[PDB]
Design a protein around this ligand. Structure first.
Ligand SMILES: Nc1ncnc2c1ncn2[C@@H]1O[C@H](COP(=O)(O)OP(=O)(O)OP(=O)(O)O)[C@@H](O)[C@H]1O
Ligand SMILES: Nc1ncnc2c1ncn2[C@@H]1O[C@H](COP(=O)(O)OP(=O)(O)O)[C@@H](O)[C@H]1O
Lengths: 874, 445, 72
């Protein structure tokens, strides 16, 4: 009963950390059972007590509502560390959404780190003690971070009202405060210009401002780079708004354009911190929550984005919930998140019991909770969730302060708003009675591409953006629409993101755009699609298209490995190498025997020879190991093999300097890639069931090798790089030559010379073409049959090598011809009926017996060795 | 033959099913209700009239017309001669754009020829109802001549029968209890209300059970002689499928919408009460715009691209936006361009996806919300701009007068909607072609 | 067989042959793929397999695979 004793000990120590070190019937039953266990199954009684003690757990969970989002096990693990002050700041990103870790100096809270690691200077320190509970100092930290955000907002407003330049303030305060300060300064200057009829002076001022910010962006390294481009997106938005107002003919048109765009305001009469800044869109008023959200990317301020923002403002003015529906890829959830990050609130994204819990948490904290793919729910859970959201909404319009959900008294926040997006391919009646549906159109990708290229500083922006969007539209129109063909906004943003690593060696201009567009789009197409892509790239782009070392190492590795350097093989190898140079997540697509394992092994060996880096290969198949064997289940805890190799590469000196490569050489099941959804993106963190966050080295490159993509989501196609094998990368004689080299490695010179001389391509091509017209049971290609033909021939020669030194050359040639004929008969057409075997004999004889063989040696027959068996009746 | 045709009607749609016992009770109603030189022809004609007068109300307008004219066709197949059949089939073929021919010359056929050569399909097709059938039953006649107490008045979208139900409740001297459905507290409230009213009496209305089909399946099937107790289960024709045993045990009633546009404006203005003069003027203009866009909504193949549903939430949103625009303006100068863009884009053009309907709505807003001195929203009425030296009450009186002054002509759908008449003629021709094709499909089998 | 990480047949002279009758008879999973034939493919192509409870690599040396299945 070792496992039972371990479980009882774990239960005892966990409940000690919960209640024994802290201070009726349930506690008395626990103390009696603990005394009985110490004197001496009680584990089931302890589980029943924990089920009965969930009401106290729920009360403690509802004491501070930030902790409500986490599960029961994570919450009790957090609560159990009530004196050690450990693990609280490690896995707290689930309750805040944008804060990863907390730094503490001299047992006092003084800083907060964002989702990427942005260090923030808190205004007031927080005392820490073992008697202080987690909820109290968590609330203190929340109040402190809100106060710090507000006082940095005040400092930014003071320094901008003092007339100081912005290049000295962009590098020391938080991005939210300078965001609000820039927006307030812009709306004040444009309103003071709206009291008159001039716009040129502040337009030139903001033009010089965006020039200075572009120069600082070119001089910034990483964090300042992200901050400056995030500010520079809305600085181009301000320039666009002022330029649009410049061309207005009358006062009424200028007033329309100014009321349509977002306007920012603050109140100089009130004294409260969290409710002193309000934004106004098309007349209505929304209050700024003053919450830290880290430094996420800013959506490019499309006019349709402002239309959608006006739609959410109209929906939230009367406490209605905004609703979106339209084709996938138009950016609906990104629009909702942009509204949240612009107005200053984190939005808890739902990937739609647990849904009801997240719903009541988001309606009891007052933050916003959005939805995605609302139509994929099962009917019962859809009805329950719809009833829950409609009843909390009906509580919201009615002005109720508390609502009863799941037989608990949950207070209703006066700031809760819930949004739902749809992907039709609909909204129920109860929800449509209380929502405001809006239809997102196709977003203007030209404006997005132009502004993104203006961040990247390319010398041609508008013409380049128009050219690339027209080129993507023409590829969408003029290609075979298969499952994995995406030519919309996601691939455009991927190409514009992948243009960054090539600009330092290729220079800013059109050629970097052409090179990255090739390296992204070209390796995911077929053959006629490749021809159409090449023709369109030559026609629409001026650039029509120093790699001696990598190609030479590739040729050397392929020649020493026995492979042949076919031109399609060389092209596919170069595309794979240039595509793994930047993108980490790659898949391999192609039929059986297309040359995928060979091409990645060739490029890995060439890379090891060229760069000098060590390579460790972990081949694995997805479908031969179950879910628990690959990841790990809670019985105690057992580690899966993938988690085992991550554990031995993270916890481990050789692995740091070595590139560990893992390949998943099987079909892409949706479950395993859904479990891989947390590492294929930019997060790069395994989500273990127990909550362990195993790190991943940047050299850990994931690969997939799958023939069929009918059972894979299009999101994985967009997120991970796709390599396509439309044609075989080998000639047939390459297959025979590599197979012969491998078999020789597994009068010998005369024997191999005669073996090589027995294979002539001019007649082999004709006999293969003739044999391809035969009927094969469980039919496979001849390209897949030479694999056993060559091995059978070499094994027969190696078996008969013992008596190959006392016969003439003509007899040896006859033996060679007979054995090659036997191998070709038994492998190429050795899977058909005997009548078709006789037809094969006639065809191969007219192009150059049925049971002819060699019997120990002479050209004997099988008819002289059959035994007439003697059988008895029983 | 009639029950076979009604069986095809039942297999067409989930709400158009008919029971055998309903047919037998309707046939007994023929003898309950108390000549062609005999008695059996009188019994047959009274059978046809009674089955029309009873089972017309369980269909919408198009199925009412096809069933009426199919019953007329069977009766005239039985009674009249071969040349009569040839003429009737010729008109059915020319109404379906299948066979073109001339009648083989009964002045009723002459009026039918004069109707169809004038391209008046609606009158030539209501000729059957106006000639053959002399009795028609409304909802009051159904509720006054039904021993069953459970009613399923399922009305299609944009058509609301609750007002007529409560008006009939006053007419029957009874207070209805409107019950919303969807929330569990309202589920328990509805259960308590029906438990009280099933023993104490009193009418009760159940509405919007579309999200509560789960509760309906779990409760009403197990749930199914008290005076003045008649519960109504208001459903929707375009909604999800009601349970079949519940439909077999309940009467089926379909409601029809008001054909006018002026009455919609009058109802919206009566439902609106309050706030300056310009706010009242904007509310009046917005009510006219909402009635115009709701009228143009129903013309599906020509007026718009597809069916839409502009309920009262959009009217409330637009009214609140107009109130906020007029209130937050200290210059008392209404920015008509901004409110035009916001009405055509966000409020009413929100759920509209394709660009042509958005352009249609923007054109309608430009025609209505222009805010000129001479505002001719329709050719019938002229609206002058309000003055400054008055109050709200005399403006309310003037606007009530200018609603009472105008009248709705018969060509309102072509004149008040700014739509060409040839599109209306093609829409009516397509409707006549569809109903003639379906009735010839029913007649050939 | 016996374990020595190499998998060794009990017969020190004779090659062990793994019979597999009715290869078509195992059923595909919920996402259009089989599992035991993929295990056999890994055994005959990668010349080994990965152990599930210990997460260790075990190679094969002289065990062959035969089949006997009807046409589909
Ligand atoms: N010149 C050559 N180039 C590439 N492969 C060659 C050449 N000559 C022979 N081959 C053989 O072709 C095979 C191609 O295998 P490939 O990578 O296409 O695997 P696959 O059938 O797709 O595998 P899986 O089904 O396991 O995913 C190599 O394993 C090798 O034995
Ligand atoms: N206004 C915009 N500016 C910049 N990028 C946008 C904009 N709208 C959408 N996008 C991009 O389009 C991509 C696709 O969005 P998607 O995830 O399909 O939204 P949804 O899931 O709601 O359909 C997003 O990655 C986003 O970066």
């Amino acid at each position: 009963i070792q496992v039972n004793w371990v479980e009882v000990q774990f239960y005892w120590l966990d409940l000690y950390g919960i209640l024994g070190e802290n201070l009726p019937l349930e506690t008395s039953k626990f103390k009696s059972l603990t005394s009985e266990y110490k004197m001496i199954l009680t584990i089931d009684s302890l589980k029943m007590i924990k089920s009965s003690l969930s009401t106290f757990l729920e009360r403690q969970r509802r004491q501070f509502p930030r902790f409500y989002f986490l599960g029961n096990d994570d919450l009790l693990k957090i609560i159990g560390s009530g004196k050690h002050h450990d693990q609280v700041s490690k896995f707290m990103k689930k309750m805040f959404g944008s804060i990863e870790s907390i730094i503490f100096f001299e047992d006092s809270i003084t800083g907060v780190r964002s989702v990427e690691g942005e260090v923030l200077n808190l205004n007031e320190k927080i005392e820490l003690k073992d008697s202080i509970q987690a909820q109290e100092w968590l609330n203190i930290l929340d109040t402190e971070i809100k106060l710090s955000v507000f006082t940095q907002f005040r400092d930014c407003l003071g320094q901008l009202k003092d007339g100081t330049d912005i290049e000295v303030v962009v590098s020391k305060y938080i991005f939210q405060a300078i965001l609000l300060s820039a927006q307030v300064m812009w709306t004040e200057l444009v309103e003071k210009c709206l009291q008159t009829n001039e716009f040129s002076k502040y337009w030139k001022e903001v033009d010089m401002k965006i020039k200075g910010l572009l120069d600082k962006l070119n001089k910034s390294s990483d964090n300042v780079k992200k901050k400056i481009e995030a500010l520079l997106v809305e600085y181009l938005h301000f320039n666009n708004v002022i330029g649009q107002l410049k061309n207005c003919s009358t006062k009424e048109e200028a007033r329309l354009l100014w009321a349509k765009v977002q306007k920012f305001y603050q109140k100089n009469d009130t004294l409260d911190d969290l409710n002193s800044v309000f934004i106004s869109q098309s007349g209505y008023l929304l209050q700024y929550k003053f919450e830290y959200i880290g430094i996420p990317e800013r959506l490019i301020y499309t006019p349709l984005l402002l239309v959608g923002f006006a739609t959410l403002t109209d929906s939230l003015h009367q406490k209605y919930g905004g609703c979106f529906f339209g084709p996938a890829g138009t950016g609906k959830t990104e629009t909702v998140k942009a509204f949240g990050q612009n107005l200053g609130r984190v939005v808890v994204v739902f990937n739609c019991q647990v849904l009801s819990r997240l719903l009541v948490g988001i309606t009891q904290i007052g933050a916003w909770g959005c939805f995605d793919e609302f139509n994929r729910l099962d009917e019962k859970v859809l009805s329950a969730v719809s009833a829950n959201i409609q009843q909390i909404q009906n509580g919201l319009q009615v002005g109720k302060s508390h609502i009863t959900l799941l037989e608990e008294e949950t207070p209703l926040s006066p700031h809760t708003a819930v949004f739902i997006t749809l992907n039709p391919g609909e909204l129920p009646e109860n929800l449509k009675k209380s929502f405001r549906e809006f239809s997102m159109k196709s977003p203007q990708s030209g404006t997005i591409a132009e502004m993104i290229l203006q961040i990247m500083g390319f010398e041609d922006s508008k013409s380049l953006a128009s050219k690339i969007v027209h080129f993507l539209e023409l590829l969408s129109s003029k290609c075979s629409s298969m499952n994995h063909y995406h030519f919309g906004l996601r691939t455009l943003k991927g190409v514009l993101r992948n243009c960054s690593p090539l600009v330092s060696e290729f220079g800013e201009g059109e050629k970097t755009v052409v090179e990255s567009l090739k390296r992204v789009i070209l390796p995911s197409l077929g053959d006629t699609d490749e021809l159409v892509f090449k023709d369109e790239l030559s026609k629409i782009f001026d650039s029509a298209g120093n790699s001696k070392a990598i190609v030479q190492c590739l040729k050397d590795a392929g020649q020493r490995s026995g492979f042949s350097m076919s031109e399609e093989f060389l092209k596919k190898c170069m595309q794979f190498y240039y595509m793994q140079k930047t993108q980490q997540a790659l898949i391999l697509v192609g039929k059986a025997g297309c040359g995928k394992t060979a091409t990645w092994k060739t490029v890995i060996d060439a890379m090891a020879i060229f760069d000098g880096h060590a390579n460790v290969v972990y081949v694995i198949d997805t479908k031969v190991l179950t879910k628990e064997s690959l990841y790990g289940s809670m019985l105690e805890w057992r580690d899966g093999l993938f988690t085992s190799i991550l554990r031995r590469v993270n916890d481990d000196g050789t692995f740091k300097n070595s590139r560990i490569w893992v390949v998943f050489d099987s079909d892409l099941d949706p479950e395993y890639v859904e479990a891989m959804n947390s590492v294929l993106d930019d997060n790069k963190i395994l989500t273990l069931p127990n909550g362990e966050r195993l790190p991943i080295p940047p050299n850990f490159r994931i690969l997939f090798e799958t023939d069929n993509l009918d059972h894979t989501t299009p999101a994985t196609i967009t997120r991970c790089g796709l390599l396509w094998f439309s044609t075989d990368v080998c000639s047939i004689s390459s297959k025979i030559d590599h197979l012969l080299n491998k078999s020789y490695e597994a009068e010998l010179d005369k024997l191999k010379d005669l073996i090589s001389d027995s294979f002539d391509m001019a007649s082999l091509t004709n006999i293969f073409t003739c044999s391809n017209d035969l009927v094969h049971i469980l039919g496979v290609r001849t390209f897949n049959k030479l694999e056993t033909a060559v091995q059978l021939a070499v094994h027969l020669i190696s078996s008969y090598r013992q008596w190959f030194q006392n016969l003439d050359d003509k007899s040896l040639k006859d033996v060679i011809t007979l054995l090659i004929k036997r191998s070709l008969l038994y492998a190429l057409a050795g899977d058909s009926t005997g009548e078709s075997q006789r037809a094969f004999i006639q065809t191969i004889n007219t192009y150059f017996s049925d049971y002819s063989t060699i019997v120990i040696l002479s050209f004997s027959s099988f008819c002289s060795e059959i035994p007439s068996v003697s059988l008895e009746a029983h | 033959k009639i029950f076979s045709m009604l069986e095809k009607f039942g297999q067409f749609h989930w709400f158009y099913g008919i029971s055998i016992g309903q047919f037998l009770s309707c046939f007994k109603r023929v003898f309950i209700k108390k000549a062609a030189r005999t008695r059996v022809d009188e019994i047959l004609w009274l059978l046809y009239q009674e089955v029309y007068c009873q089972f017309s109300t369980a269909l919408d307008k198009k199925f009412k017309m096809i069933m009426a004219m199919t019953m007329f066709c069977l009766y005239k197949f039985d009674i009249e001669s071969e040349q009569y059949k040839e003429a009737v089939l010729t008109m059915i073929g020319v109404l379906s754009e299948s066979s073109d021919g001339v009648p083989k010359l009964n002045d009723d056929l002459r009026y039918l020829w004069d109707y169809v050569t004038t391209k008046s399909y609606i009158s030539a097709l209501n000729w059957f109802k106006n000639e053959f059938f002399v009795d028609e039953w409304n909802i009051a006649d159904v509720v006054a001549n039904s021993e069953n107490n459970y009613f399923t008045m399922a009305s299609e979208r944009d058509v609301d029968g609750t007002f007529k139900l409560i008006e009939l409740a006053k007419a029957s001297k009874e207070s209805l209890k409107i019950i919303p459905l969807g929330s569990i507290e309202n589920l328990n409230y509805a259960q308590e209300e029906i438990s009280k009213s099933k023993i104490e009496g009193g009418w009760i209305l159940l509405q919007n059970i579309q999200m509560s089909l789960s509760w309906v399946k779990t409760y009403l099937h197990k749930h199914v002689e008290h005076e003045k107790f008649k519960m109504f289960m208001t459903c929707h024709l375009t909604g999800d499928k009601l349970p079949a045993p519940l439909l077999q045990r309940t009467d089926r009633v379909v409601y029809e919408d008001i054909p006018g546009i002026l009455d919609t404006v009058k109802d919206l203005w009566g439902s609106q009460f309050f706030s300056g003069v310009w706010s009242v003027y904007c509310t009046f203009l917005l009510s006219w715009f909402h009635a115009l866009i709701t009228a143009r909504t129903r013309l599906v193949p020509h007026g718009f691209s597809k069916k839409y549903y502009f309920n009262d939430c959009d009217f409330q949103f637009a009214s609140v936006y107009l109130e906020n625009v007029l209130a937050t303006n200290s210059t008392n100068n209404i920015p008509w361009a901004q409110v035009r863009d916001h009405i055509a884009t966000i409020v009413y053009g929100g759920k509209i996806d394709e660009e042509k309907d958005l352009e249609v709505v923007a054109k309608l807003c430009a025609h209505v919300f222009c805010g000129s001195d001479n505002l001719q929203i329709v050719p019938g009425v002229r609206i002058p701009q309000p003055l400054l030296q008055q109050s709200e009450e005399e403006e309310r009186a003037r606007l009530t007068a200018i609603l009472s002054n105008t009248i709705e002509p018969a060509d309102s759908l072509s004149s008040w909607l700014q739509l060409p008449r040839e599109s209306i003629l093609d829409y009516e021709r397509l409707q006549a072609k569809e109903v003639a094709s379906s009735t010839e499909q029913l007649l050939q089998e | 067989t016996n374990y020595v990480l190499t998998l060794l047949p009990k017969s020190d002279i004779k090659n062990l042959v793994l019979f597999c009758d009715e290869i078509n008879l195992p059923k595909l999973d919920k996402y259009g793929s089989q599992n035991v034939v993929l295990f056999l493919r890994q055994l005959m192509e990668k010349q080994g397999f990965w152990k599930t409870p210990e997460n260790k690599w075990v190679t094969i040396e002289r065990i062959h695979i035969v089949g006997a299945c009807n046409p589909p």
